[PDB]
Point group: C2
Chain length 90, copies 2
């Protein structure tokens, strides 16, 4: 297993750690997405403390509009973060 | 550094290992993309042995059409693989 293959597994791994906590086990609701950000992206993103920020963040990632973040939408979220972190180093 | 953050760094890491070998250091040409697939995706994708397959694969990922794979296009490639590997487990 290479570093790239390890990265792919970790992306599937972390999405399921958080999506299966409540409700639809294949989608991140607000409370699961917030904990994912707060617990797994603590060096890339600011801690989410306000309801208005979790609302805003889900509104951005929720492109098909059911109020939750599915796997496709999560992959888009990861590309955004990854592209942001890539550019940081200029 | 969490597992998700480690995944993000590895994606940026591996893209630069291969893109900076030749020519444009920010884009994967055919020969770099082939080696990336063959050396880092050996459990997810078949080894590329034929010129016709490397041509086909670059044609699929090269959405803006300059014959190379840039970082955005690479992120789309990774989402594809990741979504394919996610569904495999049904
Ligand atoms: Ca859920
Ligand atoms: Ca959604
Ligand atoms: Ca290159
Ligand atoms: Ca291109
Ligand atoms: Mn799943
Ligand atoms: Mn770069």
């Amino acid at each position: 297993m290479s570093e790239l293959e390890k990265a792919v597994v970790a992306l599937i791994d972390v999405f399921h750690q958080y999506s299966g906590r409540e409700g639809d086990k294949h989608k991140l609701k607000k409370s699961e997405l917030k904990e994912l950000i707060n617990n797994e992206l603590s060096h890339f993103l600011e801690e989410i403390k306000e309801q208005e920020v979790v609302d805003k963040v889900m509104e951005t990632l929720d492109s098909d509009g059911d109020g939750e973040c599915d796997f496709q939408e999560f992959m888009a979220f990861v590309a955004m973060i990854t592209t942001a972190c890539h550019e940081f180093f200029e």
